[PDB]
Amino acid sequence: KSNKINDALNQHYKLNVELGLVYAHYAHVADDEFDMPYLGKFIQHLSEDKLGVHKEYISDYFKRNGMKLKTDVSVAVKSIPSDAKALIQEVYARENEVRDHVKAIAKLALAEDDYESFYFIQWYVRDGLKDLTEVDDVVKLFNSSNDKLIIEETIKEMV
Amino acid sequence: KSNKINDALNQHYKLNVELGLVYAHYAHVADDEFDMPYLGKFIQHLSEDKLGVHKEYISDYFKRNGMKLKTDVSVAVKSIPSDAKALIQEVYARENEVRDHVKAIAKLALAEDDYESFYFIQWYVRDGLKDLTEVDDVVKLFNSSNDKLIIEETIKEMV
Amino acid sequence: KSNKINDALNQHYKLNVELGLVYAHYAHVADDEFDMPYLGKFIQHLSEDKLGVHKEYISDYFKRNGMKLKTDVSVAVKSIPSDAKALIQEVYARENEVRDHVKAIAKLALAEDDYESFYFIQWYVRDGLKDLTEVDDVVKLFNSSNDKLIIEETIKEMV
Amino acid sequence: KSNKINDALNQHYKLNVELGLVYAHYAHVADDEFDMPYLGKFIQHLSEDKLGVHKEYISDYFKRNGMKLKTDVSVAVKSIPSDAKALIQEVYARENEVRDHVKAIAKLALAEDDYESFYFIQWYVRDGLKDLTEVDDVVKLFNSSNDKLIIEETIKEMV
Amino acid sequence: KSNKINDALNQHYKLNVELGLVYAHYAHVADDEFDMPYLGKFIQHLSEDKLGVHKEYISDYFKRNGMKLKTDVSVAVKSIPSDAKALIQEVYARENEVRDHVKAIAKLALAEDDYESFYFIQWYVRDGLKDLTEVDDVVKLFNSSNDKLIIEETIKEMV
Amino acid sequence: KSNKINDALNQHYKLNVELGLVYAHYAHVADDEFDMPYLGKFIQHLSEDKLGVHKEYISDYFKRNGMKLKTDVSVAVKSIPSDAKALIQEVYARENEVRDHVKAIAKLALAEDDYESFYFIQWYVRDGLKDLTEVDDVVKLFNSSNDKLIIEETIKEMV
Amino acid sequence: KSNKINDALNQHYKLNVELGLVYAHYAHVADDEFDMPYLGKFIQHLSEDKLGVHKEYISDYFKRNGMKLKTDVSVAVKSIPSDAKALIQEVYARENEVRDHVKAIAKLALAEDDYESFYFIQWYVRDGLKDLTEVDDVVKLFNSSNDKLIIEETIKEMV
Ligand SMILES: [Cl-]
Ligand SMILES: [Cl-]
Ligand SMILES: [Cl-]
Ligand SMILES: [Cl-]
Ligand SMILES: [Cl-]
Ligand SMILES: [Cl-]
Ligand SMILES: [Cl-]
Ligand SMILES: [Cl-]
Ligand SMILES: [Cl-]
Ligand SMILES: [Cl-]
Ligand SMILES: [Cl-]
Ligand SMILES: [Cl-]
Ligand SMILES: [Cl-]
Ligand SMILES: [Cl-]
Ligand SMILES: [Fe+3]
Ligand SMILES: [Fe+3]
Ligand SMILES: [Fe+3]
Ligand SMILES: [Fe+3]
Ligand SMILES: [Fe+3]
Ligand SMILES: [Fe+3]
Ligand SMILES: [Fe+3]
Ligand SMILES: [Fe+3]
Ligand SMILES: [Fe+3]
Ligand SMILES: [Fe+3]
Ligand SMILES: [Fe+3]
Ligand SMILES: [Fe+3]
Ligand SMILES: [Fe+3]
Ligand SMILES: [Fe+3]
Ligand SMILES: [Fe+3]
Ligand SMILES: [Fe+3]
Ligand SMILES: [Fe+3]
Ligand SMILES: [Fe+3]
Ligand SMILES: [Fe+3]
Ligand SMILES: [Fe+3]
Ligand SMILES: [Fe+3]
Ligand SMILES: [Fe+3]
Ligand SMILES: [Fe+3]
Ligand SMILES: [Fe+3]
Ligand SMILES: [Fe+3]
Ligand SMILES: [Fe+3]
Ligand SMILES: [Fe+3]
Ligand SMILES: [Fe+3]
Ligand SMILES: [Fe+3]
Ligand SMILES: [Fe+3]
Ligand SMILES: [Fe+3]
Ligand SMILES: [Fe+3]
Ligand SMILES: [Fe+3]
Ligand SMILES: [Fe+3]
Ligand SMILES: [Fe+3]
Ligand SMILES: [Fe+3]
Ligand SMILES: [Fe+3]
Ligand SMILES: [Fe+3]
Ligand SMILES: [Fe+3]
Ligand SMILES: [Fe+3]
Ligand SMILES: [Fe+3]
Ligand SMILES: [Fe+3]
Ligand SMILES: [Fe+3]
Ligand SMILES: [Fe+3]
Ligand SMILES: [Fe+3]
Ligand SMILES: [Fe+3]
Ligand SMILES: [Fe+3]
Ligand SMILES: [Fe+3]
Ligand SMILES: [Fe+3]
Ligand SMILES: [Fe+3]
Ligand SMILES: [Fe+3]
Ligand SMILES: [Fe+3]
Ligand SMILES: [Fe+3]
Ligand SMILES: [Fe+3]
Ligand SMILES: [Fe+3]
Ligand SMILES: [Fe+3]
Ligand SMILES: [Fe+3]
Ligand SMILES: [Fe+3]
Ligand SMILES: [Fe+3]
Ligand SMILES: [Fe+3]
Ligand SMILES: [Fe+3]
Ligand SMILES: [Fe+3]
Ligand SMILES: [Mg+2]
Ligand SMILES: [Mg+2]
Ligand SMILES: [Mg+2]
Ligand SMILES: [Mg+2]
Ligand SMILES: [Mg+2]
Ligand SMILES: [Mg+2]
Ligand SMILES: [Mg+2]
């Protein structure tokens, strides 16, 4: 097993956990402070996504190839974006950074001739683009209407 | 809303998140290092429990009564118990401490005449005893047999 | 049986009856004067709630523990809020006062060592918070959009 | 719209509310003090009848023809009939007075050439006679047997 | 675990066992000596209630919190009430005393900050009032009719 | 009716009640102290057997033939066997004594030419042998394996 | 088509055939000599896997891209591992070597810009890790218990 891939995947595990905890806070704020419970449910589903399969796939993959899991988590939510559009724009920015880290891991697996890892990362390559697409669709709405309740209703059909 | 109850519930939110992240690591170790995948699935279900409804009930309760959510999370898993029995014994110890914190919150709600909070905490009072009972049943097995595969098979029927 | 609990529960019976009659008027006004029939149906359901189980639970509880029922009802609706948002804001204020009276009854039952009464009041402790949450969700909409028909459509899915 | 019909219908709304609150008390007393829970359920159904459709039909009719609703309610139950037969005899007397008020409203609608109102009142003309028939059937039983449990059993099949 | 709560719950276990054995005798006598087999089945169901879940909940609760079970039972039925009404009146008296013991245990749990115990006792707080209500409904019948077969038939529908 | 049969059956009623209360304690101890919850459920089913039909058949038989029921119960569980095998061995000993008392009642019924009683006792003659067979099958396991969890699993299929 | 990829895939075809024939022998020995028929069925399923789709996918892929199939097979099973744990440990070693050959083919396809081949090999990259995981799970059991029949029973649920 590759130590650099092991480290890179342990950092991605850490990123998904910390992002998931931030999104859970953002989801609470979207509902409570911004009166957009469907925006909150959208962000909450992203939170459970990062804290669910996004982190468990890595821990399960480690079991198979003899890599070691590291749990080292530090996250504090110290400021909140000022309104709902800024809130989901901040979610978009974090999701775009996820794509960059995933790209680095794919590049490294090919450099290490670690084709089991390149394969494993394929899911994340795809899911990074679709999570970002789902978020971008929501960011769209805030530039498409000035009525929070119209946006809310549109979110309800986007699940 | 009570500031002391708000602080006490924010600390319990923090405890459930951090416990959930530790259990996820313990579940990985139970399977990978100790060859007890059903012990791992038992601990993993506890992890999803703490990181799921145990934390979301608090955030949802805050939305209703005007309390504020705090996300301040710090956890590192720096040593692992040496074998499976010590692993689940350590889970038992953490679950027993949960009962003590839950008791303090119930006592405080009555002191504050905060009966909505005393009510909310009732679930946790009960779930604290049953989570501890489920864990204690697993600790039982390691003193009841010296065969890991017998214990494993018994865990598989305890879900 | 406690005379003070009996008096406190008889006043709560009186409050639920009088609130129910006011809400029935408010529901009529929401539909007829303000053109918001779904706001009216929301308020009408609150009216039937107070005039239904909220009052009958008390009368039934009295049958069990030997307390006496008092019927002494006086209510006149002499002014109406000027628009729909003020109408539902006034409903919110009344529902928040209900929480305070419920809290006093819980405190008194513990003071009297009347644990059957503390138990009975638990439903009301919970229902006070959820009725207030349902009303607060509707008050949200009037600060989320300036289009009565958008608010109306959003109410129709909130039942 | 007719002001006299509006006033006459507002008084009938007031009568149905106040009668409904009295019957709810009578139903409680029939069960608790007189040991006739089925007599109580009979009277309770009359209570929900007056406090339900009997009052809501008027408020809904007002929405259609531009009449105004008045909520002005004053009722105290200060004495209770001494036994069950007197209790249901008192219910009969109140129901018979309802017929007289309904008759006055029908007479007035014809005098005003208000045929929408004469039509609306037709339901009440009929329901006044059948409510009084249902009550009279129960009053029958107390002159037909001296055994409360026989009367109770007969009430249970009369719904 | 609290020693005083342990003792108080062990005495309640003892009370439910001894009451259950007395009711089983009373049920036999209601059928055989008093010709009221449905009164007997009513009392027999109370007997199985006390000797069933009323005692097993305590023993199961002890397993969870580390309290010890005591079995110390002494009961002799040395006199029987003279007729059926006195028989069920005596059942009522015993059930009313159960409420008082349950109240003492709830008061003690709050005094000990034993919120798991206060929670456990909630069932008994409620069941004490409803068992007493069921018995009181049967005592009602003996003051409502002088015909044992009418009372019997009424009991058959009260289960 | 025979006075000696009446006395012999009243003593058997007393034996089944007292045995049932002891088994309920033994079942609690098998689960809590010995970590054998399925052994506990086996013993608990024996407890409900003695406290159920084993005692009610006698009380019902008395109703038919004019014998009198006596309730005189005295039982204290003052020592517990030291381990699970001794626990079920003690259950076996008590069940074997039941066979001897049942035999004495059958012998007495034939001596009294009480053929209704000899018939009634036939069930007990049979059930005495099968209850003892069920218990003996469990005692078998403790001499067949030294692993409590293997024994536990075998008990789970023996119901 | 690449001659080096053609040669590398023809060697992998040869490896899967020869491994499949060895596993078929090992499966026979696991059942017959070692009394572990479920271990035998596990190894037999691996045998049919290598001799089935693992070899036919290659021959079918050759049909599509114009590569030539070579059949050149030489295998003799001349010694058998001494016990069951050594038997499955030897299976593990062979499966781990399969991963190395699969890795070389993936590396070569990228070197040849043969992306149809890199794609085809992806299945094998994944199946190499899961076949090795399935085998490793069985090797686990021999270090988890010293009872062949416990291991056998555990294998039966692992299919
Ligand atoms: Cl941070
Ligand atoms: Cl690889
Ligand atoms: Cl830490
Ligand atoms: Cl409160
Ligand atoms: Cl007023
Ligand atoms: Cl109480
Ligand atoms: Cl009045
Ligand atoms: Cl007209
Ligand atoms: Cl006694
Ligand atoms: Cl507690
Ligand atoms: Cl004794
Ligand atoms: Cl005979
Ligand atoms: Cl060879
Ligand atoms: Cl290509
Ligand atoms: Fe919400
Ligand atoms: Fe996903
Ligand atoms: Fe950070
Ligand atoms: Fe903005
Ligand atoms: Fe995702
Ligand atoms: Fe996704
Ligand atoms: Fe829509
Ligand atoms: Fe729409
Ligand atoms: Fe739609
Ligand atoms: Fe596994
Ligand atoms: Fe749970
Ligand atoms: Fe920490
Ligand atoms: Fe250890
Ligand atoms: Fe839980
Ligand atoms: Fe739980
Ligand atoms: Fe087994
Ligand atoms: Fe099994
Ligand atoms: Fe099984
Ligand atoms: Fe309308
Ligand atoms: Fe409700
Ligand atoms: Fe008022
Ligand atoms: Fe306004
Ligand atoms: Fe409500
Ligand atoms: Fe409600
Ligand atoms: Fe719309
Ligand atoms: Fe819609
Ligand atoms: Fe819709
Ligand atoms: Fe009743
Ligand atoms: Fe009607
Ligand atoms: Fe009046
Ligand atoms: Fe009279
Ligand atoms: Fe009517
Ligand atoms: Fe009617
Ligand atoms: Fe009938
Ligand atoms: Fe009948
Ligand atoms: Fe009938
Ligand atoms: Fe009978
Ligand atoms: Fe019950
Ligand atoms: Fe006694
Ligand atoms: Fe008497
Ligand atoms: Fe009960
Ligand atoms: Fe009950
Ligand atoms: Fe009859
Ligand atoms: Fe009947
Ligand atoms: Fe009937
Ligand atoms: Fe258990
Ligand atoms: Fe049986
Ligand atoms: Fe004894
Ligand atoms: Fe022993
Ligand atoms: Fe039996
Ligand atoms: Fe049996
Ligand atoms: Fe089995
Ligand atoms: Fe098994
Ligand atoms: Fe089985
Ligand atoms: Fe075979
Ligand atoms: Fe396969
Ligand atoms: Fe070879
Ligand atoms: Fe070996
Ligand atoms: Fe394969
Ligand atoms: Fe495979
Ligand atoms: Fe099995
Ligand atoms: Fe099985
Ligand atoms: Mg390279
Ligand atoms: Mg206080
Ligand atoms: Mg006090
Ligand atoms: Mg005219
Ligand atoms: Mg205190
Ligand atoms: Mg003879
Ligand atoms: Mg190249």
CA F131 to chain centre: 7
How large is the greatest C-alpha to C-alpha distance in chain G, in angstroms? 53
**Chain A residues touching residue G125 (CB < 8 angstroms):** 115-116, 119
What's the rounded Cα separation, in Å, for the pair B41 and E20? Answer: 44
What's the rounded Cα separation, in Å, for the pair D132 and D103? Answer: 14
G138 vs B: CB within 8 A: no
Tell me if F28 and E63 make a contact (CB, 8 A cut-off). yes
Secondary structure string (H, E, C) spanning chain B: CCHHHHHHHHHHHHHHHHHHHHHHHHHHHHHHCCCCHHHHHHHHHHHHHHHCHHHHHHHHHHHHHCCCCCCEEEEECCCCCCCHHHHHHHHHHHHHHHHHHHHHHHHHHHHCCCHHHHHHHHHHHHHHHHHHHHHHHHHHHHHHCCCHHHHHHHHHHCC
Q: Are C61 and C120 in contact (CB under 8 A)?
A: yes
**What 3-state class would DSSP assign to F39?**
helix
Distance C9 CA to ligand 34 centre (A): 18
Burial of residue A130 (CB within 10 Å: 0-12, 13-18, 19+) is exposed
What's the rounded Cα separation, in Å, for the pair G17 and G56? Answer: 10
Burial of residue F121 (CB within 10 Å: 0-12, 13-18, 19+) is buried
Tell me if C28 and D55 make a contact (CB, 8 A cut-off). no
**Chain C residues touching residue D51 (CB < 8 angstroms):** 51
User: Cβ contacts of residue E14 below 8 Å, gap of 6+?
Assistant: E70, E72, E73
Phi, psi of B114 (to 5 degrees): -105, 85
Tell me if B147 and G145 make a contact (CB, 8 A cut-off). yes
Q: Are F48 and E56 in contact (CB under 8 A)?
A: no
Q: Which ligand is nearest to the CA of F46?
A: 64
- Judged by phi (left if over 0) then psi (alpha if -120 to 50, else beta), residue G35 lies in left
How many other CB atoms sit within 10 Å of the CB of residue F143? 8
G111 vs A: CB within 8 A: no
| Cα torsion C79, C81, C83, C87: sign | negative
Tell me if A148 and C144 make a contact (CB, 8 A cut-off). yes
Q: What single DSSP character describes residue A35?
A: S
Task: Using the structure block, give the residue that is written with the tokens 């459709």.
Answer: D53
Phi, psi of G33 (to 5 degrees): -85, -30
E69 vs F: CB within 8 A: yes
Phi, psi of D158 (to 5 degrees): -95, 0
What's the rounded Cα separation, in Å, for the pair B143 and B147? Answer: 10
Of residues C107, C110, C126, nearest to B119 (C-beta): C126
Q: Are E109 and E121 in contact (CB under 8 A)?
A: yes
Q: Are E131 and E95 in contact (CB under 8 A)?
A: yes
Tell me if D24 and C76 make a contact (CB, 8 A cut-off). no
- Closest C-alpha to E103, from G109, B21, C112, B116: C112
Element at D75 (helix H, strand E): strand D72-76
Residue ranges near ligand 65 (ion) with Cβ within 5 Å: F 127, 131
Q: What share of chain A is helix, strand, coil (3-state, %, to 5)?
A: 80, 5, 20
Q: Which ligand is nearest to the CA of C59?
A: 42
User: Cβ contacts of residue B145 below 8 Å, gap of 6+?
Assistant: B151, B154, F147, F148, F149, F150
Residues paired with E74 in a beta bridge: F74
Q: What is the DSSP string of chain G?
A: --HHHHHHHHHHHHHHHHHHHHHHHHHHHHHHTTS-HHHHHHHHHHHHHHHTHHHHHHHHHHHHHTPPP------------SSHHHHHHHHHHHHHHHHHHHHHHHHHHHHTT-HHHHHHHHHHHHHHHHHHHHHHHHHHHHHH-S-HHHHHHHHHH--
What's the rounded Cα separation, in Å, for the pair C95 and C91? Answer: 6
CA B63 to chain centre: 23
In degrees, rounded to 5, the angle at the alpha carbon of residue D126 between the alpha carbons of residues D121 and D132 is: 120
- Closest C-alpha to B149, from B158, B141, B140: B141
E141 vs D: CB within 8 A: yes
How many other CB atoms sit within 10 Å of the CB of residue C92? 16
Instruction: Provide the token pair at B85.
Output: 């029995």
What's the rounded Cα separation, in Å, for the pair C140 and F99? Answer: 76
Residue type, B139: V
Size of interface B-C (CB pairs under 8 A): 25
Q: Are B89 and B81 in contact (CB under 8 A)?
A: yes
CA A124 vs CA A20, A104, A110, G125, G128: distances in Å:
16, 12, 15, 17, 21
Nearest CA in chain D to E141: D149
Q: What is the DSSP string of E72-97?
A: EEEEE-----SSHHHHHHHHHHHHHH
| CA atoms in the 13 A half-sphere facing the CB of E147 | 9
What's the rounded Cα separation, in Å, for the pair F4 and C7? Answer: 62
- Closest C-alpha to D121, from D106, D131, D104: D106
Q: Are D55 and D16 in contact (CB under 8 A)?
A: yes
How many other CB atoms sit within 10 Å of the CB of residue A100? 9
Distance E27 CA to ligand 56 centre (A): 17
What's the rounded Cα separation, in Å, for the pair B18 and B77? Answer: 10
What's the rounded Cα separation, in Å, for the pair D6 and E37? Answer: 61
Instruction: Provide the token pair at A113.
Output: 């001739």
Tell me if E62 and F25 make a contact (CB, 8 A cut-off). no
A148 vs C: CB within 8 A: yes
Residue ranges near ligand 24 (ion) with Cβ within 5 Å: B 37
**Chain E residues touching residue C63 (CB < 8 angstroms):** 133
Distance B132 CA to ligand 29 centre (A): 9
Do E and F make contact via 3 or more CB pairs under 8 A? The reply is: yes
Tell me if F71 and E21 make a contact (CB, 8 A cut-off). yes
Of residues E59, E69, E73, nearest to F73 (C-beta): E73
C25 vs D: CB within 8 A: yes
Tell me if A71 and B76 make a contact (CB, 8 A cut-off). yes
Q: End-to-end alpha-carbon separation of chain B, Å?
A: 40
User: What resolution in angstrom units was achieved for this structure?
Assistant: 2.1
Residue type, F142: F
Residues paired with F76 in a beta bridge: E72
Task: Using the structure block, give the residue that is written with the tokens 């259609």.
Answer: D64
Residue type, G107: K
User: Cβ contacts of residue D92 below 8 Å, gap of 6+?
Assistant: D132, D135, D136, D139
Element at F75 (helix H, strand E): strand F72-76
C46 vs A: CB within 8 A: no
**What 3-state class would DSSP assign to F72?**
strand
**What 3-state class would DSSP assign to E66?**
coil
Tell me if A110 and G110 make a contact (CB, 8 A cut-off). yes
Tell me if B153 and G151 make a contact (CB, 8 A cut-off). no
Instruction: Provide the token pair at C58.
Output: 């008390």
Residue ranges near ligand 47 (ion) with Cβ within 5 Å: D 127, 131
- Sequence length of chain D is 159
Tell me if D76 and C71 make a contact (CB, 8 A cut-off). yes
